[PDB]
Design a protein around this motif. Structure first.
Motif, mmCIF file in Angstrom:
data_model
loop_
_atom_site.group_PDB
_atom_site.id
_atom_site.type_symbol
_atom_site.label_atom_id
_atom_site.label_comp_id
_atom_site.label_asym_id
_atom_site.label_seq_id
_atom_site.Cartn_x
_atom_site.Cartn_y
_atom_site.Cartn_z
ATOM 1 N N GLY A 186 0.823 -1.201 0.000
ATOM 2 C CA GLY A 186 0.000 0.000 0.000
ATOM 3 C C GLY A 186 0.853 1.245 0.000
ATOM 4 N N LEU A 187 0.284 2.362 -0.446
ATOM 5 C CA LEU A 187 0.963 3.648 -0.384
ATOM 6 C C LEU A 187 0.294 4.518 0.648
ATOM 7 C CD1 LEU A 187 1.847 2.913 -3.588
ATOM 8 C CD2 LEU A 187 2.492 5.309 -3.398
ATOM 9 N N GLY A 188 1.046 4.879 1.689
ATOM 10 C CA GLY A 188 0.537 5.702 2.795
ATOM 11 C C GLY A 188 0.684 7.180 2.485
ATOM 12 N N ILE A 189 0.100 8.042 3.321
ATOM 13 C CA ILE A 189 0.184 9.480 3.056
ATOM 14 C C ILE A 189 1.647 9.993 3.143
ATOM 15 C CG2 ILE A 189 -2.239 9.671 3.968
ATOM 16 C CD1 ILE A 189 0.379 12.129 5.273
ATOM 17 N N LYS B 65 5.532 4.323 2.100
ATOM 18 C CA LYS B 65 4.862 3.083 1.661
ATOM 19 C C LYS B 65 4.901 1.947 2.694
ATOM 20 C CE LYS B 65 7.912 3.413 -2.071
ATOM 21 N NZ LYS B 65 9.185 3.928 -1.439
ATOM 22 N N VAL B 66 4.089 0.925 2.467
ATOM 23 C CA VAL B 66 3.928 -0.164 3.405
ATOM 24 C C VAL B 66 4.442 -1.394 2.710
ATOM 25 C CG1 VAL B 66 2.284 -1.524 4.753
ATOM 26 C CG2 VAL B 66 1.803 0.867 4.321
ATOM 27 N N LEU B 67 5.358 -2.111 3.359
ATOM 28 C CA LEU B 67 5.981 -3.306 2.768
ATOM 29 C C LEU B 67 5.618 -4.572 3.496
ATOM 30 C CD1 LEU B 67 9.577 -1.754 2.512
ATOM 31 C CD2 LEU B 67 7.926 -1.940 0.630
ATOM 32 N N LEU C 154 4.989 -3.453 7.302
ATOM 33 C CA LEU C 154 5.925 -2.457 7.804
ATOM 34 C C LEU C 154 5.700 -1.126 7.112
ATOM 35 C CD1 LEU C 154 8.673 -1.882 9.342
ATOM 36 C CD2 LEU C 154 9.712 -2.250 7.212
ATOM 37 N N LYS C 155 5.460 -0.083 7.889
ATOM 38 C CA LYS C 155 5.354 1.266 7.339
ATOM 39 C C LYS C 155 6.592 2.020 7.740
ATOM 40 C CE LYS C 155 1.824 4.450 6.776
ATOM 41 N NZ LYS C 155 0.877 5.546 7.164
ATOM 42 N N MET C 156 7.223 2.655 6.769
ATOM 43 C CA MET C 156 8.476 3.351 6.979
ATOM 44 C C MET C 156 8.293 4.855 6.949
ATOM 45 S SD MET C 156 11.858 1.980 5.170
ATOM 46 C CE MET C 156 12.561 3.562 5.787
ATOM 47 N N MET D 216 2.856 -3.486 11.805
ATOM 48 C CA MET D 216 1.471 -3.769 12.132
ATOM 49 C C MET D 216 0.953 -5.081 11.582
ATOM 50 S SD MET D 216 0.239 -0.468 10.127
ATOM 51 C CE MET D 216 1.245 0.136 8.775
ATOM 52 N N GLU D 217 -0.130 -5.575 12.175
ATOM 53 C CA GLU D 217 -0.736 -6.842 11.788
ATOM 54 C C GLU D 217 -1.015 -6.859 10.290
ATOM 55 O OE1 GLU D 217 -5.106 -5.333 13.424
ATOM 56 O OE2 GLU D 217 -4.910 -7.515 13.224
ATOM 57 N N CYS D 218 -0.963 -8.034 9.665
ATOM 58 C CA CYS D 218 -1.201 -8.145 8.220
ATOM 59 C C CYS D 218 -2.676 -8.270 7.810
ATOM 60 C CB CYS D 218 -0.406 -9.311 7.667
ATOM 61 S SG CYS D 218 -0.098 -9.233 5.902
ATOM 62 N N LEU D 219 -3.162 -7.264 7.088
ATOM 63 C CA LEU D 219 -4.563 -7.220 6.672
ATOM 64 C C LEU D 219 -4.722 -7.703 5.242
ATOM 65 C CD1 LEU D 219 -5.414 -3.677 7.947
ATOM 66 C CD2 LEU D 219 -5.802 -5.782 9.191
ATOM 67 N N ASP D 220 -4.569 -9.010 5.027
ATOM 68 C CA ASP D 220 -4.499 -9.561 3.669
ATOM 69 C C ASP D 220 -5.862 -9.845 3.086
ATOM 70 O OD1 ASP D 220 -2.864 -12.028 5.468
ATOM 71 O OD2 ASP D 220 -4.978 -12.285 4.861
ATOM 72 N N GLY D 221 -6.924 -9.501 3.806
ATOM 73 C CA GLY D 221 -8.274 -9.551 3.253
ATOM 74 C C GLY D 221 -8.545 -8.512 2.187
ATOM 75 N N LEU E 45 -9.479 0.010 10.200
ATOM 76 C CA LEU E 45 -9.138 1.318 9.651
ATOM 77 C C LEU E 45 -7.632 1.548 9.798
ATOM 78 C CD1 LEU E 45 -10.266 4.135 8.605
ATOM 79 C CD2 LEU E 45 -10.358 4.739 10.981
ATOM 80 N N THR E 46 -7.010 2.147 8.785
ATOM 81 C CA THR E 46 -5.568 2.357 8.780
ATOM 82 C C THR E 46 -5.227 3.797 8.498
ATOM 83 O OG1 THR E 46 -5.273 2.071 6.386
ATOM 84 C CG2 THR E 46 -5.275 0.090 7.713
ATOM 85 N N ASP E 47 -3.939 4.119 8.646
ATOM 86 C CA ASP E 47 -3.295 5.407 8.252
ATOM 87 C C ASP E 47 -3.630 6.627 9.122
ATOM 88 O OD1 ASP E 47 -1.740 7.364 6.940
ATOM 89 O OD2 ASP E 47 -2.266 6.653 4.921
ATOM 90 N N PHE E 48 -2.724 6.981 10.027
ATOM 91 C CA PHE E 48 -2.963 8.120 10.916
ATOM 92 C C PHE E 48 -2.148 9.327 10.515
ATOM 93 C CE2 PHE E 48 -5.757 6.675 14.364
ATOM 94 C CZ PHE E 48 -5.960 5.365 13.904
#
Ligand SMILES: O=C1NCCc2[nH]c(-c3ccnc(-c4cnc5ccccc5c4)c3)cc21
Ligand SMILES: O=C1NCCc2[nH]c(-c3ccnc(-c4cnc5ccccc5c4)c3)cc21
Ligand SMILES: O=C1NCCc2[nH]c(-c3ccnc(-c4cnc5ccccc5c4)c3)cc21
Ligand SMILES: O=C1NCCc2[nH]c(-c3ccnc(-c4cnc5ccccc5c4)c3)cc21
Lengths: 285, 284, 290, 283
Positions: free
Chosen positions: A26-29, A32-34, A47-49, A93-98, A158-161
């Motif tokens: 995913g691409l965060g604000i 990115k999330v790996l 992992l969000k960097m 963070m936990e993996c949301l693969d749904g 819900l994600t991304d703060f």
């Protein structure tokens, strides 16, 4: 007496504990999330960097606070490491693969009004928790709503703060207990937009003349999609999409609305969402 | 994918882990350096004592960042303790018992142009690393260049971040990517002054000194400089430009053939070794 | 692809093109309106005279922008001239010789005024406000005197005039508050619309006179009624709409889009033909209307 | 005695004069460029749409001033219209259907050092004109360099004044910061790509940013083994990290490699192939 533990930032290198792939999840604000794997346990995590600064410090701080809520992506660990001679917050963070909310909806062949009510209720719960601890999310969108697994009883989270902000005798009025601007009521609009899409498959605001239709509040409930949808729901949507922020419904009023309250007493009427969503893969990029 | 670990400040008393002697190993810009011994391992280390504040916090922060470089003194641990009811940063670093750079040069009887080139290249490498991660050292002097051991293959290392400062689409000019003043080019001058002393044994600048520096009045006098190739003099001339922006960058310096091919530099002997001991007086 | 032409300010003397009479056609917020005639064509027009300054420049600028709308008085030309050694904006607009809105209402007896017609009138005033708001302009002076008809002919269009108080008001999921600040400029037109709607249905204002420094407080308190006999036929749906435009708290007030979507405005032709007292109460009260 | 006419802004609707398609011809720094056709003449033109404000007023103003130069895209007309009740500057410019500079290079099968010299000279000329009238372009990139036609004798033209800024012994005649020297860097970057097919500063992403401020690049083989030391030395001097060490546009136009384009060796470069062979990381 409930206390929960505070945040211990790990300082050792993250690669001691995890194998870091470079598959983007995913691409965060702001970063990115790996996909990463627990070295010892083999299990998968996200992992969000972030680059260390007051902005990234706040994201972590606010996300940790909300991490207790069942409907908010759970933070597993936070690392502070050096990456190319600069400091780094690395959030595990936990993996949301749904996958995303609207990807799951898009994969059937039907979606009912009662399920939309159940989805909305769980998004509502996340917002409700946040607001009650004085945090506005400020970026509630389709891409930030993911499921834990593909299994049909997965939890929506819900994600991304990255945009989240803090919002600050016994008969004393709510205004006299601290200032507070419109930060919160802005999540309530998102909730309306999401609810609208959930019931028909398209947004209420379409294709520089879009910008004016939003400030004017020009949208409709066109047929054939909306002809089955009860007037009760249309009325709730109308009230979340009020252009004037203070006319808008609060999250407590929303969680108390009978359509959300009694999810299981909502008509099983089928919606077009499932098909309209795949039938419109184009202008969704 | 390279990440290195961040800094974990230890909070327990330093005396739990180390025996602290009061043998002074050097005077830093803000606090002296003492000899200490690892209680458990018996091994020797150096302790720099700083009083906690924003200044000291920055020294530790910047030094930790640069500590990865092979040519910069390595930080072993950082303690935060109470000392006479005030907060303290205590930095434990590796022991550089090879002594100062010019002490090692001063102890032979000869030094060659090729060796000066190899020394300059390793100092260069330290500056190159610092600059690449946006840190100016701002205090590169003889006292801050020490050797790990006395053994003849010891590494030269740079110390003291007391003056160090931070310096801040894909075709856009270097000026349009962040402001940045003359912090960096000021290291490049030190590099020139050290190179000069390395080749002859005295500084290029001797209240009328203050004006010879701002004017840029110095020479390459004989007999010391008569052997030294014009190529090197030209490099020194370019590091010692009084106008900071006319000065050579560290990348240009590391690419200069005299630095690049250290081993293709003439073995010509210099006077440095003797001029240095012969002038023990005005070096205090 | 719809572009419309911008404003070309004519620099030549206006008297080259028009015969300027000194028959006053109205008093504007900053300069009166005079009757003038096209020299070549003989046709009649209205001239508004403003003294050049940032204020007058804004009026012209904003009015030009709104001039496209069918329910806003059309600007024909703008002249910049020297009058007694000072600069001047002279605005030439179409002639609205149908007179004021309440003058036309005031002139019947033969077929009385009906609830359905009030609905049609309110809809066309609304259309003007809707356009203005949608291009981020608040009118801020919607009154009876600013609503005129193009002709006396019974199919004349109603038009809004006077931009002397007009002011500018400034991905896919973003809230309206996060797209630019914006105070209460707009909601203030919504109140006027409520006051106009009230008068249109009974012939007097909701806020009175007498004491008369006590009118000022009945407005801030929101004290008004729907007294009989005038209001006894008027449907509760309409009273509820008026109640909602006349809210004293500006934010509680209905927006123009909500108003244009209200069934009473939406379906003008499905509104009962019930007759109102407006026509008579209006002439019967010529006095306290000066 | 040379005066040129000033700018008359047309106020009538642009659709009176032109048929406006919605085929996008490019994306500008503040508004896209569309294909349009002259209603009477049938001829094709490009329309850039800007929202009226001080920023847009300056772009038009500065572009008009430079529009005289043969190597800058020529403004045909400027309209001021109402679009969705907001004011608009619409700029009509000549149609540069020759495409981008590096698209034309990418389409052969060979490119020579002498031709790179001729291209660099014409870019130089546009910069030289701008600087002499005290305007820095501040956005000289591959996408802003287009050809008038596909015909092999087409003129190369510079576009987009969205970043352009006015720049006001030579120091005692007005202040002036580093606005201009920043174009000189662009010229070096463009020249580098023109000779080998890739940029001097790489991908590999946050460590690119530091290689630019450090000035770490090379002339690697096999591409650069043919290229004369004289040219490498010129590139080295345009890519100086210190803005004031950098060459001025006058010095650049006087350098023998640019001056005598036709006395430059005909040596072939790899540019043509390296450019198509690397279609991927060019998006
Ligand atoms: O904060 C964020 N920024 C914006 C998008 C995002 N996704 C995540 C995230 C977190 C945990 N798991 C995932 C994830 C894992 N696996 C997936 C498989 C298939 C589709 C999406 C997936 C997302 C994404 C975090 C953030
Ligand atoms: O940061 C600093 N500031 C200036 C003084 C200093 N000395 C050191 C230092 C660091 C590590 N080892 C030494 C050292 C060890 N042993 C020695 C033996 C004999 C002479 C000098 C010595 C220095 C000094 C660091 C700093
Ligand atoms: O901007 C204004 N300020 C407030 C008053 C006004 N009246 C007008 C106006 C505009 C065009 N025509 C008229 C007009 C024309 N002919 C009439 C004949 C009989 C009665 C009234 C008339 C008004 C008035 C403009 C303005
Ligand atoms: O100012 C600008 N901003 C950056 C992009 C741009 N393109 C243009 C432009 C100007 C004139 N013609 C064109 C043009 C026309 N026709 C084309 C056909 C095929 C390829 C490129 C073309 C460019 C583009 C101007 C600008």
């Amino acid at each position: 007496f409930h206390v929960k533990s505070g945040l211990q930032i790990k300082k050792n290198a993250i690669i001691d504990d995890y194998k870091v792939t470079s598959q983007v999840l995913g691409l965060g604000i702001n970063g990115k999330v790996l996909q990463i794997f627990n070295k010892r346990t083999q299990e998968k995590f996200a992992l969000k960097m972030l680059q260390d600064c007051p902005k990234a410090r706040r994201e972590v701080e606010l996300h940790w606070r909300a991490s207790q809520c069942p409907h908010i992506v759970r933070i597993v660990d936070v690392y502070e490491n050096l990456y190319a001679g600069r400091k780094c917050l690395l959030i595990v963070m936990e993996c949301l693969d749904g996958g995303e909310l609207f990807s799951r909806i898009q994969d059937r062949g039907a979606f009912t009004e009662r399920e939309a009510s159940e989805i909305m209720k769980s998004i509502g719960e996340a917002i409700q928790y946040l607001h009650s601890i004085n945090i506005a999310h400020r970026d509630v969108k389709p891409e930030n709503l993911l499921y834990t697994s593909k299994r049909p009883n997965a939890i929506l989270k819900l994600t991304d703060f990255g945009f989240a902000k803090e919002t600050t005798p016994y008969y004393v009025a709510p205004e006299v207990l601290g200032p507070e601007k419109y930060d919160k009521s802005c999540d309530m609009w998102s909730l309306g937009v999401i609810m609208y899409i959930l019931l028909c498959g398209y947004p209420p605001f379409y294709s520089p003349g879009m910008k004016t239709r939003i400030r004017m509040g020009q949208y409709e409930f066109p047929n054939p999609e909306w002809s089955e949808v009860s007037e009760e729901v249309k009325m709730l949507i109308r009230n979340l999409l009020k252009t004037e922020p203070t006319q808008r419904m609060t999250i407590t009023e929303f969680m108390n609305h009978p359509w959300i309250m009694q999810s299981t007493k909502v008509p099983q009427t089928p919606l077009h969402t499932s098909r309209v969503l795949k039938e419109d893969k184009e202008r969704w990029e």
